[model samples]
Each structure stands twice: as structure tokens, then as C-alpha cells.
Target: HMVNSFSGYLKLTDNVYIKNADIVEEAKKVKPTVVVNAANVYLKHGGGVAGALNKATNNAMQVESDDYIATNGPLKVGGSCVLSGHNLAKHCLHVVGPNVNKGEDIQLLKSAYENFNQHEVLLAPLLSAGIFGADPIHSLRVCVDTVRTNVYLAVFDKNLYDKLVSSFLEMK
Candidate 1:
């Protein structure tokens, strides 16, 4: 029965909501305690949501986050670094995940979400699915199903939002 599907902690349901708004604008409304950043292995805020957050706050965000990372090599797939939100949210959790088109590691993406355990409201984008190129639907589905707390999936692009809603509405 559809009602008897894997609707445990494994399902995407009532706890989630989808919207089309700028990540920064949407985040302001939610006032999240924390937010997720899909970052490069080197932890630079050059583009994507990372760049937006850095611009929203100050240019020094990436430099500051680098200090927190303190790594000479690439960050592991599911590895995360916590940084001050600097007016974005109370905190920012950054994760280095598989590159574009890499849809096989939903587990790694899910693990990144787990790092925000104590947070209340969480703002996130399609991790590894944006400029870096992970599969969009697959990435967002992971966010919808595995987020540890209240999470908002920011949709800046209309087409992307449509795809996300279509995929998520059928969650069962």
C-alpha cells in the first residue's frame, strides 16, 4: 500500500516544503539557525551558493572558512566545515561532495546533512548539483529525505524549481 511505504525517517513528507526564491532572500524569511554550503574541496567561495553567502556577508568568508578547514589536501566526499554565518544564518556548514553528474553518492550527501544535527531551521541548495554538476533531482531528493532538521531548498532558477517540485511531489 502507498500508505505503508518506507515512511519512517527514510521518507520525505510533512516536514518539508518547496519554494522558488533566492537563497539569501528565502533564508532571511526562515531565519535559519544554520545553512549548508556545497563547497569545493579547497573551500573557496568563488561561485554558487558559497559565493552568494560570501557576498551577502563579506568577502572574507572564504578566507575565514579556510582557517576552519585547515587542510592541505582535498576534503573527503562527506567532509564538512562549520563557519560563522556572518549575517547569513547563525552558522554555516560547508561540505565537499562529488563533482557534477555524480549522483551515486546519496549517502555522502546525506552524511553532510547530518552534520547540522542541533540546528533548527536549515537553508540549503542542491549540493554538488549546482555549478559543480551533480544530478539535480537525485541531489535534491537526498536533501528532502535525509535532512536532520527543518531545511529549505532554495530555488533561484525557475526550471530547476519546477523539476524539484515535480520530483518531490511524488515522494512516497
Candidate 2:
């Protein structure tokens, strides 16, 4: 179930949904046109949300991601690569967000959301808030401020969800 919802601005026509649910399971239920994975530079599905998605897709995502990297090389921060979602969604967009510790600018995070602008419906997570260590509030701000597609922001942490919800409301 959705925890909160908000309308996007004129240029951004799609609605933003905040859901306290697992992104993979939500993808199974919603079956969005695309699911955005907060990926590493190498697109490795070793752990985090990427791992869950790879596991749900029965490792096909991992195989395809590996091939994609081998062919096109490692994805740069703010860049994205698409792969077959197997059965989760029509496609999985692996996005490499900026790591603040690496001296990456926050603007790159906005670019990550911008990369998937062509898609209609997307299931996304709070990128860079995990091992990459981006602040949750800043991540959520960038996500809501940049996404143009109908996006479901799936957040599993209760406290984080509450904090994001509050920040989201403040944005409105």
C-alpha cells in the first residue's frame, strides 16, 4: 500500500508515489514499464536492492548486466544501462548515482533520474542512500525534484520512510 502520494509539476506530468514496500515485490505487483536499480559503477548485483532484483529475476539480470558492462564498459555516475527484467518488468534500468565520498556532485544524482525520462512508469529506490552513503533527505529531494515519469519510490526502512514522508510533504 502507498504511504503517500504527490503530484508532479507542469513539465513533470506523472505522479510520485511513496510506498513502504520491497521494490522487487512491488515490481511484481505493479509490473511497471521499467524498474530502476540503484547500481554500482560495474553494475554488480552483489547486494542491496540490486541483489534482490537479480535474485528475483533468477540471475538473468546479473548475466545481462555482466555482458552489458563487458561490451559497453563500466557505467559512469549519472549514466544508465537497460537490461531485460526477465519477468519483473519490461526492462531494468541500472543507474549509477553519485557517491558523495568520491567528491561526486549531487547534480549527478539528478542526472540519474533524468536518464530514464523517456520511460512512462518506473519503480525506483532512494539511490545512493545505502552503502554509497548519500543522505536520505537529499536523495529523496533529488528523486522527487527530477523524475518526470510516474515513479514509485520504494523505501523499506521505517524511520527513513517517516523522514522522507515529512520531507516530501515539506516540498509540496
Candidate 3:
């Protein structure tokens, strides 16, 4: 429940930056009701812990909604993640979306963990690519197979079939 040696669950004051007490003071001053309604949150790009973990669990082949969250309704389509529950990710959902395969697409994938070497982050880059594409399996190839893990998963799907396959069929 800690990252960079600075994290805890249900501290009521957890953030990578800023002191918990200061944030609490500010929240109390405003007395605002915080409702975390997030969707289309593709963790492959930019997502916090819950978002990242949610997508990761699903990609790992964890079946059924409850397999991840305590409440089946929480991740049901567009439902928002419940804040500070017995299950922190109990309410989070994976709103998968296709990534824009343009400049620095690979870098974008690598940034999941803020830097390279985070295996889960690196290995999971293809989850979005695959599940959101016409062929999730092919996407898996690009994301989980090509790079072969540890750093990143390169594209190895039909998307590259044309560029990679030689026109001359080899039969010997």
C-alpha cells in the first residue's frame, strides 16, 4: 500500500504530493462533497493507483466483476469508484479505449509507471491496445508479446502483418 516508501491505506490524507493534514484542512474549509465519477479511464496512459490496478487485474484474466471489486455494480459500465471503501478499488471500473497510435506512442506506454522497469506497468501496456481493438488477442501480441516484457510490449498484431510479412510466400 506504499509507493516510493510513502503511502498508506485510509490515512484520510494520502497523496504523492502535499501533506494529508493540509489537504484535510483545505477540504474542511470548502466542506465540499467529493464524488469520484471516472470513466473511459485507460490506465495504459495516465491513471492513478486505483485506475492502474483496476485495468491490470482485468488484463491478468481475473474473471467476473466481483473478482476485482466487492460490489458488482461498482464497475458496471459507467459507475464511479467508491471512495475509501473496505475495498479501495471496489468501485473502480475499466473504461477501455483505443489509444492514438501517433508520435511517442511507445513512450506514452512506458510512462505508465513514471519510468521504465515497472514490469506490471510495462507488461500491461497492451491491455488497452488489445481489449479495445477488434482483435484483443492481436493487441495482446503487440502489448504483451512483441517486447516480451520487463520494459515494454511492442506491436506484433495484424496491424503489422502487412509491414512485416514478406509478399513472397515462403514454403521451404
Candidate 4:
């Protein structure tokens, strides 16, 4: 579907799709082999997209994160942690992004995206911005670039969604 001269389902390549929809709902419907959580290295998912994911996963993500901390310590900026499918996703990739309240590590966000093993299907959200206060457009660009497989981006924010659309247009 196209909106504002931009397609919600933009086919960047063969399999990647950028959607302006509910992330959790899309994740459930897609049942992706992998889902990414844009998070903080501090292991707190109290607000923003991370908080919603925390809720959608039945707080299981936090428990898993706590375990990761107990065993491996806090995640480093741009670092990632993986868990075998929790709720909507068969597998979850939690990566810390750089932003306010979190260390400024925009480069690491790309690195976190790079670190993942591309599965057949992958779902991710706009990292940073909102609570973290990083540029959503840049985050989206990186996601589109770093992901090598079928990728779906669940974007809800109006401005952010618009920016995403604009970014794609700019590319073309």
C-alpha cells in the first residue's frame, strides 16, 4: 500500500519490506525467524518501543536479559544478545543503540545490525529516537543496509514513518 507518495510495503530488494504498522502485531503475523529489539546496554526496557516489546513478550525478555547480565554482565554499546524465540518471535536479537540516556553510539547501532545472523525472515523496529533521542531516519537506513534477508520494519510514529518514506525516495 502506498501513502503520501511512498509505499508502506516498499520492496527494497526481493524480500525486505518497510511497513507503517504495529510492530508487535506484524511480528505475530509474520512469525519471523528473527525479531530485533532496539535496546539499551543497561538492560532496561521501561519505555518506548523496547517497553512495548517487553510487554508483548510477556516480560520474558527482561528475565532473559537479567540472566544475561547475571552471567555475562551488561551489554556493551552496539553489542547484542540473543534468545531462542520468546513470544511472537522464534528468535530474538536484542541490540543496544546509541542515544540520549544511553551512550551516543550511532555507529554501534549499525554494528549491532551487522552482527546478526540473517534468517529467512527478520522483523525490526526503528531504533533510537522517542525515548532514546537518536535519529530514526539514520537508524532505518542502517537497518535497511545491514539486514541481508527479508526484513520488515514496523513504524508507528508519523514523522518517523514519513522520514523513512523520504529516505527510500532519496535512495531511488
Top candidate by TM-score: 2
Lowest lDDT sum, 10 consecutive residues, model 4, at: 1-10
In candidate 3, stretches whose alpha carbon ends up further than 4 angstroms from where it belongs are 1-60, 71-116, 120-127, 130-149, 152-172
Winner on lDDT (1 vs 4): 4
Task: Please estimate how well model 4 matches the true structure, expressed as its whole-model Cα lDDT.
Answer: 0.72
Candidate 2 residue pairs in backbone clash: none
lDDT (Cα atoms) of all candidates against the true structure: 0.68, 0.80, 0.28, 0.72
Model 3, range 134-171, lDDT digits (tens) per residue?
A: 33333332332233223212223444433322221232
Give the alpha carbon lDDT tens digit for every residue of 1-172 in model 2.
4321323222222466776788887778777678899998898999999899999999999899988889998988999988887788888889999988777887898888887677877778888888878898888778777877677788888788878777667666
TM-score (C-alpha, index-matched) for candidate 4: 0.83
For candidate 3, which ten residues in a row score worst on lDDT?
9-18
Q: Which 10 successive residues of model 2 have the least lDDT summed?
A: 3-12
Candidate 3, residue 76: CA error in Å? 15
Model 4 Cα shift for residue 132 (angstroms): 2.3
Tell me, by lDDT, which candidate is best.
2
Ranking by lDDT: 2, 4, 1, 3
lDDT of 2 at 171: 62
